[PDB]
From a paper:
Class B members, known as the metallo-β-lactamases (MBLs), are structurally distinct from the Class A, C, and D enzymes, require one or two zinc ions for catalytic activity, and are not inhibited by currently approved therapeutics.
The first crystals of NDM-4 utilized in this investigation were grown at room temperature using poly(ethylene glycol) 3350 as the precipitant (pH 6.0). The model of the enzyme was refined to an overall R-factor of 17.9% at 1.3 Å resolution. The electron density for the polypeptide chain was continuous from Gly 42 to Arg 270. The two zincs that form the binuclear metal center are separated by 3.5 Å.
Numbering used by the authors: 42 to 270
Write the structure that this text describes.
């Protein structure tokens, strides 16, 4: 089901939901896939995460123009790393309103990234404060606690069986938790389990660096994270 578009890949997950995939070569290691989401909600499109680069992100918008041909109302980006926020300038050039965790916006400059235009904040239990996420339609944004990064956030899609763990969640057969350089090793396991508890009905778990999986991605990730503490 993978549709090639230039150097990117697009996969329809549900009637109005597509996964976007972009790649960054790393000498000595390999080309790393990063996944985000595209959601049609009525007469607009919503984006979750940029691609690694501005050019790649502009290609996502080109795909949306060709395949959906509706305005992109907003994007939400799920932490201040290159795979999630590397293409912010491309969104802004296109006139797209952008949203991120307040802390992501705070950290973005020092990470060599451009901040989103708008900051999300979260209730104590981790649900986004709804007034900070206007017009998010079916996107349900949840801060599961610090894990992959301190600022990592997650997104469920109402009307679907899909929840997006971003770089918090790895697939059920993953051999590691990837890049832990900015991780909270104490809180990771609890944060993974909190993601699963936030979206208990989601049967399709989408994530940054693996193809969509069953909820065994959550249990496996949490089990691996237990060993960090
Ligand atoms: Zn990351
Ligand atoms: Zn990542």
């Amino acid at each position: 089901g993978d549709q090639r578009f230039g150097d990117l890949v697009f996969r329809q997950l549900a009637p109005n939901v597509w996964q976007h995939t972009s790649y960054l070569d790393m000498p000595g290691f390999g080309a790393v896939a990063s996944n985000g989401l595209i959601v049609r909600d009525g007469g607009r499109v919503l984006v979750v995460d940029t691609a690694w680069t501005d050019d790649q992100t502009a290609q996502i918008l080109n795909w949306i123009k060709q395949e959906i041909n509706l305005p992109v109302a907003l994007a939400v980006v799920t932490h201040a790393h290159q795979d999630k926020m590397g293409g912010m300038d491309a969104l802004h050039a296109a006139g797209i309103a952008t949203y991120a965790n307040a802390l992501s916006n705070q950290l973005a400059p020092q990470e060599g990234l451009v901040a989103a235009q708008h900051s999300l904040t979260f209730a104590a239990n981790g649900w986004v404060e709804p007034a900070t996420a206007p017009n998010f339609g079916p996107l349900k944004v949840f801060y599961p606690g610090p894990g992959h990064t301190s600022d990592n956030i997650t997104v469920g899609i109402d009307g679907t069986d899909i929840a997006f763990g971003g770089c918090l969640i790895k697939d059920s057969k993953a051999k590691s938790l990837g890049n832990l350089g900015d991780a909270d090793t104490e809180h990771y396991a609890a944060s993974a389990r909190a993601f699963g508890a936030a979206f208990p009905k989601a049967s399709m778990i989408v994530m940054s660096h693996s193809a969509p999986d069953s909820r065994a991605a959550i249990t496996h990730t949490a089990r691996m994270a237990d060993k960090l503490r």
